[PDB]
Structures are given as structure tokens and as C-alpha cells.
Design a protein around this ligand. Structure first.
Ligand SMILES: [Zn+2]
Ligand SMILES: [Zn+2]
Lengths: 190, 10
């Protein structure tokens, strides 16, 4: 029944909790710094939520934005060697969503793809949305639907748990044109 | 419902 201030009180939290509860809150706390939501381990930026979009605009100029709830994410050059990243932004319902495609090295020459959407917003806000990722090919279709992650949470855990759209190179070839992959992204509200 | 060519991060 002794109460401790949140470690992010200096940033404005005002929550005080029993030690039993302290870390569980501090992991979820809105006043926790946001890390750069871009894929890969190159950018080490951190800041508040309101600083994220300007950051992305200053430091990640190549990232393109599309307005609309229903768009096509065309990842080019998917067979180009290494582990690689694709990222773009989708604007709708008064929010920005980051679309990420990530290629990883798996067991042998075989590689795996992970595709996922994050909300540029809080976890609570993230709960109001759903997204759908669609791969389309000749007489085929692969679909993944879920709740977007808040960038507060990030995608490392989701991707690690296959909690996103997961497919490997052979799957990729079925849906690819040239060396490019079209991903249909549809956002909706719950 | 448009499309966007996205190149690898680099
Ligand atoms: Zn707090
Ligand atoms: Zn960054």
C-alpha cells in the first residue's frame, strides 16, 4: 500500500502505483518514449508521439505517403539479395499507418517475409482499427486481417511470434510480377 | 485505391 511515482512522472505521468504494478504500467505508459518505427537497426531515434511524424519527414525522406483506406503497397525488387526492408505510409481516419515489409534469412537459401501495419498513435487508439493485407495472383489470394500495433509497442515481438502476414520466397513468386510484390492494404474501424 | 511503387529501404 506504499505508492511509487511512475518513472515517467518527469515527463508528465501523474500515476503512482504499488511496486507490484509499477513495471507493468511503465511498459504501457503513454509518457514512455517512442522509438523510430522504421524497420531495421539503423535509426536510433527516440522521442514523444508528436515528434514522430516530423522525424520521419526529416530523416526518412524516401518514405512515401498515400491518402486512402484502401491502397496498393508495391514492393519493388523483392528478390535482390540480403535481408531487406520496405516501408510506406497510409493516411486515413485522421491517422497515419506505417506499412512494413521485411525480408529475413531463414534456414538455407530460403528466406521469409513478414508484412505488418502499425498505427502512428497510442495502443488504446490502435484498438479502434483493423487492417487487411491481401496478396493476389492468378486464381489465388492470401489474406491476413488483424488489429494494427501501436508504434509504441513496435513489431519486433509480433514478427517474432509470426503475428502478422508471414510467407516465404516460394510463396512470394506465386504473387510477384517481375521482382515486385503488390500488397493490398485496407484499413477499417472496429 | 491507388498504387505506390516502393523501392527497398536501400
Ligand atoms: Zn506512467
Ligand atoms: Zn528514424
Amino acid at each position: 500500500s506504499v505508492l511509487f511515482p511512475c518513472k515517467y512522472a518527469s515527463s508528465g505521468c501523474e500515476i503512482t502505483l504499488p511496486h507490484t504494478e509499477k513495471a507493468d504500467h511503465e511498459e504501457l505508459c503513454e509518457f514512455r518514449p517512442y522509438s523510430c518505427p522504421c524497420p531495421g537497426a539503423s535509426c536510433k531515434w527516440q522521442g514523444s508521439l508528436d515528434a514522430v511524424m516530423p522525424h520521419l519527414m526529416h530523416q526518412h525522406k524516401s518514405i512515401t505517403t498515400l491518402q486512402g483506406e484502401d491502397i496498393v503497397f508495391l514492393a519493388t525488387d523483392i528478390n535482390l539479395p540480403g535481408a531487406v526492408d520496405w516501408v510506406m505510409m497510409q493516411s486515413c481516419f485522421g491517422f497515419h499507418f506505417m506499412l512494413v515489409l521485411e525480408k529475413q534469412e531463414k534456414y538455407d537459401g530460403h528466406q521469409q517475409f513478414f508484412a505488418i501495419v502499425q498505427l502512428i498513435g497510442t495502443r488504446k487508439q490502435a484498438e479502434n482499427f483493423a487492417y487487411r493485407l491481401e496478396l493476389n495472383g492468378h486464381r489465388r489470394r492470401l489474406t491476413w486481417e488483424a488489429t494494427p500495433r501501436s508504434i509504441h509497442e513496435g513489431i519486433a515481438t509480433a514478427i517474432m511470434n509470426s503475428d502478422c502476414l508471414v510467407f516465404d520466397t516460394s510463396i512470394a513468386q506465386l504473387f510477384a510480377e517481375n521482382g515486385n510484390l503488390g500488397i493490398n492494404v485496407t484499413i477499417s474501424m472496429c | 485505391p491507388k498504387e505506390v511503387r516502393v523501392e527497398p529501404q536501400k
